[PDB]
C-alpha cells in the first residue's frame, strides 16, 4: 500500500493539473502493476481486471468510464518528458529502434519483441523509475530474465554490478562489495542496477545483510573505522557537487541514505518451486514471467525464419488445418504454414512430456531456449542443404556444357578406318546427356521438399535427444502426420542418420569406439551439430571413450566434478581453448551456468566471462561435454535450459531393434543387404555416382582430335552406364523391397521380444542377491554363442 | 531542372562521405561513427519521393546500407585485441591497400568487408586467442613479480615463514596452467617466454618443497 502511495505520488509530482479520469487511470495502472504482475493463472488476472473496474465504478459514481478505462492501459516516460499515458504502436516502434541499436553495441544476439516482452520491459522500467524500486523476477529458466534486466539497465543508463561468488566468499568480502556499491551509488550519484542471480546466489548466508537496503537503504555498522572518515569526506564532496550544503555527521548520513534510496536499484532473478523468506517477497515487487504463449512463439519463429526462402506459389491450402495460433492469416501462405507447424512441434512435445510425466517416467523441463535452438538449427540446416543443392546443380550445368562441347568436337571429327567406331562413341554421349537432363528434373522436385524435410530433421536435432527410440519415433510420426495435414511436401521415408552425416563421417565414427546401432548413430549425429554444449546419459561408459577418440587431435583433457582441482581445469580449458570432457555432472557446480548460456561480456577488447571470483577470457575453440555414468537422475530446470541431452541408455525398443538387426544379418543376409541398399538409396549412392561423374569430367574435356586414338574411353563412359542403371533399377524396385524386409522382419520379431524380456529379467535380477550382477556383454555373448557357435545349427 | 535539385541534395551527402572517410583510423571513435552514419541515414530518409527513381540516390543508399552492415565489423576491428601481427595477416590475405599504419578510414572502407567476412572473422578469432593468452601472461607476471613471503615471529629467536598452503596452491595452479598452455593452439608466438617462466616456476617449487622440510624437522629438533 505504501508502494502504491509512492507510485501515485511520483506520478503526480511533475504534473501540473489532472482531471479525475487521469488520477483514477494512474491509480488503476498502479493497481495492475502491483497486483496482476505476481499472478500465475490467467483466471486470477481476469478476476483482477474485472474487480478493478468494479471497484472503480463502485467508489466513483458519475464518472465517465471509457475516458478513464481503456483496457490497453500503458504509461511511459521515453516518448515525452512527462509520464503521460501512451499507446502501444509508438512505444513498440521506439523499443524496436532501441533494441536494434542494442544489437550492435555490446552483444550480437537477435531478439524478438512480441506483446508480452514489451509489457515486461515497461514493468522493469517502471520499477527503475520509483525510489526504493526493487524487483524480483520469477518464471521459468531463460525466457527473459538476465537479458531484459540488462536491456532496460542499458536503456535507462544504469550500470550493472554483479557479485562473483565461489567457494571462498566470507561476510567480510560481501561487506567490502556492499561498501564499494554504496559508495559508488551514494557519493558519485551513479545509478546501479545491482542484479542478483540464482546461480551465484541460492543461499550465501548473508542474504539478510541486504534486507536493510531493501527496507530503508542503509546498513548500520558497515562503515565502522576509517571508512566512516572516507565516506564522510566523499559525502561532503558529493553534497557540495550537487549543491546541498550540509555540515554535521548525521545530516550528511541522511543525505547519503536519501541518495541510496534514489539511485541504487536491486533486481533478483529467481526460479519458482529451499523457499525464500516472506520478508524478501514483501521487500521487492514481484514480476511473473511465465512461459511464452502461442503468439510469442509464432512471433519468434516468424522474425527468425523470415530470411530464408519459404515461398511456394503453387501451394494449395488444405480444407482444415490443425491450428494452434488462432490469429493466423486465413488462408495461410507456405511460410505461415511452416511457422504454424513449427509452434505445433513445441506444443506436441509439451503434451508428450506431460503424458510421459503422467506415466511416472523421468521427464525434463522444456524451455523457450529449446525453441530458439530448434529455429537456429532449422536456419543453419536449410542454408546448408540449399547451398549443397545449388552447388551440385551448377556442377551439373558445367557437365552439360562440356558434354555439348565434346559433341561439337565429335561432329568436327566427322570430317575424316576409325570413322565408324568414333561415330559409335557419340552414340553413347548424347544418350548420357539425356540421362543427365533427367536428373535435372529430379533436382527441381528436390526443391519442392527440401524445406519441410529440414524441419523434420531440425527438431529431431534439438528436441528429441533425451527420449528413447520408441518415443523419438512416435514424435517423428506425429510431426510427419501434421506436416501431411498441412500440405507440406517432404520425403516420405527419411534416414535421420544419413541426412545429417555422410558415409565418410560414419566410417570415422565406426573407426572410433562407437557401436553400430540406430540409437547410437542418431546420438552421434547429435554431437556434431549442437549449439548448446551437450550432456550424455551413458550407463556403459562408451560415450566418454567415443568423445575422447573424436577430439584427441585437439588434446581433450579429462576431468570430473568430484575432483578438488576441478575449477582450475575448467578455467584453463576456458582460457586456452582446449576442449573439455567433464564427468559426474550429478554433482553439478552452478559455476558452469554462464558458460553453457554463453554469457560473454564485451569489455573493451576483452571477452569476459565470470568464473569464480575471476573474469576470464573465452577462447573461441572451447567446447565442453558433460557426462553421467548414472542414468537415474533428476536435473534442475535451470540445467534443462542450458544443455542438450543425449541418451546412450538401453531400453526395450533399442535392444529389440539391435537383436532384430543382428538375427537378420546372421540368418538372412540377402534381406539385410536389400535393406541396407534401401538405406543407400539416399545420398550415399548418389554421392558416389556424382564423384564418378566429376572424375569423368576430369578427363572429358581432353578432346581436341585426340579421343579417337584408340576409341576405348567409351568403357569409362560405360562404367557409368551400368551403375546409374542400377540406381535406375533400385529406385524403380523400391516398394517390393520395403514389403519384403517388413515381412521378413515380422517373421523374426518375437525372438527379439524374447531377447529383450530375457535381458531385462537379467538386469532386474540384481535385487534378489548382491551376487546376481550380469552385464550387457553377458547377454551379447549369449546371443553370439547361440547365433554363431551353436553345435545344433549345423 | 530536377537534376540540379537532386545533385544539390547529393553534393553535401557525398561531401559528408568524404569527411567521414578522411577521419584517421587511429582517431576513430566507432560509436560516434555509428551516430554519424545514422545521421547520414536519416538525412537520406528525409529526402522526398521525386528523387526515388534516379539511380544516384539509390546507389548512395545501398552504399550506406553496406556501410551500416559493416559498422559492426568496424566496431570489432577497432578493438584492442588486434595487434600489428594481425594487421600483417590482414595484409597477407587482403593483398591490396598497402597501409603504412597512417590508417585512413577510406582505405579500410573501400575493401569489400561484406564479401571478405570469413577472413576478418578468422583474423579476429586469432586476435581474441592471442589477447587471452597475453593477458594470462600479464596476470602471471603481475602476481608472481609482487608475491611476498609472510614472516611470523618464533619465540623471539627466529622469524619463520607462514602460509605454505596458499603459496603451494598458487605454484600448482600456475604450473598446471603452463602445462595446459603448452597444449593451446596459440602457443608458438609467445613460446620461449612461457618456457622461461615455466623454468622459473619450477625453480620456485624446487625451493619450497625443500623449504618446509628444512623448516619442519628443525622446529621439531628445537622441540
Residue numbers in the entry:
A (entry chain A): 2799 to 3071, 3079 to 3221, 3470 to 3847
B (entry chain A): 1327 to 1549
Question: What text does the study give?
Answer:
Cytoplasmic dynein is a microtubule motor vital for cellular organization and division. It functions as a ~4 MDa complex containing its cofactor dynactin and a cargo-specific coiled-coil adaptor. The formation of dynein-dynactin-adaptor (DDA) complexes is a key regulatory step in dynein activation. Here, we determine the cryo-electron microscopy structure of dynein-dynactin on microtubules with LIS1 and the lysosomal adaptor JIP3.
In our structure, the two dynein dimers adopt different conformations. On the other hand, the microtubule-bound dynein-B motor domains have a straight linker docked onto AAA5 and are in a post-powerstroke state (high microtubule affinity). In contrast, the dynein-B motors contain ADP and AMP-PNP in AAA1 and AAA3, respectively. The dynein-B motor domains are both in contact with the microtubule via their stalks, whereas the dynein-A motors are lifted away from the microtubule surface. However, 3D classification shows no evidence of any DDA complexes with LIS1 bound to dynein-B. In contrast our DDR structure, solved in the same AMP-PNP nucleotide condition but without LIS1, showed all motors in a post-powerstroke state bound to the microtubule. In our structure, dynein-B is in a post-powerstroke conformation and lacks LIS1 leading to the question of why it is different from dynein-A. Given reports that LIS1 encourages binding of a second dynein dimer it seems probable that dynein-B also engages LIS1 during DDA complex assembly. However, unlike the LIS1 molecules on dynein-A, which are additionally stabilized by the presence of p150, those on dynein-B are likely displaced by microtubule binding. This agrees with studies showing how LIS1’s interaction with dynein motors is incompatible with the microtubule-bound conformation and implies dynein-B is the first motor to contact the microtubule.
